[PDB]
Design a protein around this ligand. Structure first.
Ligand SMILES: [Zn+2]
Ligand SMILES: [Zn+2]
Lengths: 133, 137
């Protein structure tokens, strides 16, 4: 649904604004990513009633907050620099895995295991862990 | 593929009724109510009945039995890092195994501690406890 909604919003900008010739305030929207979050699922059976067969199926709960962890930065893009020729790559995360290059990508520089990870040039995403009672 | 991946049923047994065993002239042991002190190691693997009071109840927890993996190189499903399927084993290149929880076998699990009743304890001792596992529905 989320991918459909993202495409639908893209279609909405294309169809309802520029195809309708109303305006053109959609240039950047082609690039930004959307997400739609369902909230009002029918009343559920509570935490103590949940069962293993309910895994991966959207449910609803209520509770009280007790402990909140700070904003943990989660990796999304890795920044690598070659330790002998200073070439910089941009490796993205695919399904939660980091693929470290074994050789420098440049034709001239082909030293094996010559790449290094720079911690503070990476791009992170906010992760918060909340505890509910 | 293994049958257990599709079995939607769970199997249970209930013991012989003492009235029926006496009627058929047999010495039933399955339905005899046993205290944790009478439960020796000799009865390991036997079907027995335990009589006592519940003291602790663990909440419902999932329990995996067979972990299912998928290989993009060959498309086979491996049931338990590198794919051990026949195609990848013969080939020089082997696909990486990725865990798939949807196809994995899961069961509902709880653990409960039973404790001896007062009349079962001989004078001078402490009421011992035994662990009970509950699985399935
Ligand atoms: Zn290099
Ligand atoms: Zn394979």
């Amino acid at each position: 649904v989320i991918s459909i909604m993202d495409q639908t919003i893209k279609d909405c900008m294309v169809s309802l604004i520029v195809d309708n010739n109303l305006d053109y305030d959609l240039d950047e929207i082609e690039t930004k990513f959307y997400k739609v979050r369902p909230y009002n699922v029918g009343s559920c059976k509570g935490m103590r009633e949940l069962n293993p067969n309910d895994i991966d199926k959207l449910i609803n709960l209520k509770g009280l907050v007790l402990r909140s962890t700070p904003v943990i930065p989660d990796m999304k893009v890795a920044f690598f620099k070659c330790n002998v020729c200073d070439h910089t790559m941009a490796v993205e995360i695919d399904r939660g895995v980091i693929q470290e290059p074994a050789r420098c990508e440049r034709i001239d520089c082909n030293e094996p295991n010559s790449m290094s990870l720079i911690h503070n040039r990476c791009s992170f995403a906010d992760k918060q862990v909340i505890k509910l009672q | 593929f293994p049958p257990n991946l599709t079995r939607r049923y769970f199997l249970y047994f209930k013991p012989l009724s003492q009235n029926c065993a006496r009627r058929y002239r047999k010495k039933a042991i399955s339905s005899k109510p046993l205290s944790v002190r009478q439960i020796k190691g000799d009865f390991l693997g036997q079907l027995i009945t335990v009589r006592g009071i519940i003291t602790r109840v663990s909440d419902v927890k999932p329990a995996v039995e067979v972990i299912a993996y998928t290989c993009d190189q060959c498309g086979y499903e491996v049931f338990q890092s590198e794919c051990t399927s026949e195609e990848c084993s013969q080939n020089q290149t082997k696909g990486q195994l990725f865990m798939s929880t949807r196809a994995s076998k899961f069961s509902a699990f709880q653990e409960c501690k039973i404790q001896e009743l007062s009349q079962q304890v001989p004078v001078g001792h402490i009421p011992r406890s035994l662990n009970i596992h509950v699985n399935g529905t």
